[PDB]
mmCIF file of C-alpha atoms in Angstrom:
data_model
loop_
_atom_site.group_PDB
_atom_site.id
_atom_site.type_symbol
_atom_site.label_atom_id
_atom_site.label_comp_id
_atom_site.label_asym_id
_atom_site.label_seq_id
_atom_site.Cartn_x
_atom_site.Cartn_y
_atom_site.Cartn_z
ATOM 1 C CA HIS A 1 52.840 -14.150 4.251
ATOM 2 C CA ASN A 2 56.460 -13.685 5.362
ATOM 3 C CA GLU A 3 59.518 -11.983 3.870
ATOM 4 C CA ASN A 4 63.082 -11.110 4.799
ATOM 5 C CA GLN A 5 65.335 -8.899 2.624
ATOM 6 C CA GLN A 6 68.950 -7.725 3.026
ATOM 7 C CA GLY A 7 71.207 -5.637 0.755
ATOM 8 C CA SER A 8 74.607 -3.921 1.008
ATOM 9 C CA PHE A 9 76.510 -1.675 -1.443
ATOM 10 C CA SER A 10 79.982 -0.018 -1.449
ATOM 11 C CA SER A 11 81.824 2.600 -3.586
ATOM 12 C CA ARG A 12 90.762 14.237 -2.331
ATOM 13 C CA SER A 13 90.091 10.673 -1.062
ATOM 14 C CA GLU A 14 86.372 9.767 -0.655
ATOM 15 C CA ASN A 15 84.476 6.494 0.166
ATOM 16 C CA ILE A 16 80.801 5.344 0.659
ATOM 17 C CA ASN A 17 79.200 2.236 2.294
ATOM 18 C CA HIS A 18 75.456 1.308 2.476
ATOM 19 C CA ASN A 19 73.092 -1.268 4.063
ATOM 20 C CA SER A 20 69.326 -1.917 4.003
ATOM 21 C CA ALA A 21 66.958 -4.635 5.256
ATOM 22 C CA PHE A 22 63.214 -5.402 5.562
ATOM 23 C CA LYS A 23 61.084 -8.046 7.339
ATOM 24 C CA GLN A 24 57.397 -8.929 7.326
ATOM 25 C CA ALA A 25 55.237 -11.632 8.882
ATOM 26 C CA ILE A 26 51.407 -11.485 8.437
ATOM 27 C CA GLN A 27 48.642 -13.974 9.164
ATOM 28 C CA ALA A 28 44.892 -13.946 8.533
ATOM 29 C CA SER A 29 41.965 -16.305 9.010
ATOM 30 C CA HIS A 30 38.228 -16.416 8.478
ATOM 31 C CA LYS A 31 35.826 -19.011 9.866
ATOM 32 C CA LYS A 32 32.126 -19.523 9.143
ATOM 33 C CA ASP A 33 29.664 -21.809 10.862
#
């Protein structure tokens, strides 16, 4: 399994800016003899 995610968002004088990200990489195995 692997994932990558990115997001960014933006909105007296007042202002807001935002970022987020995520990553995963996972591996599994089973063997039988």
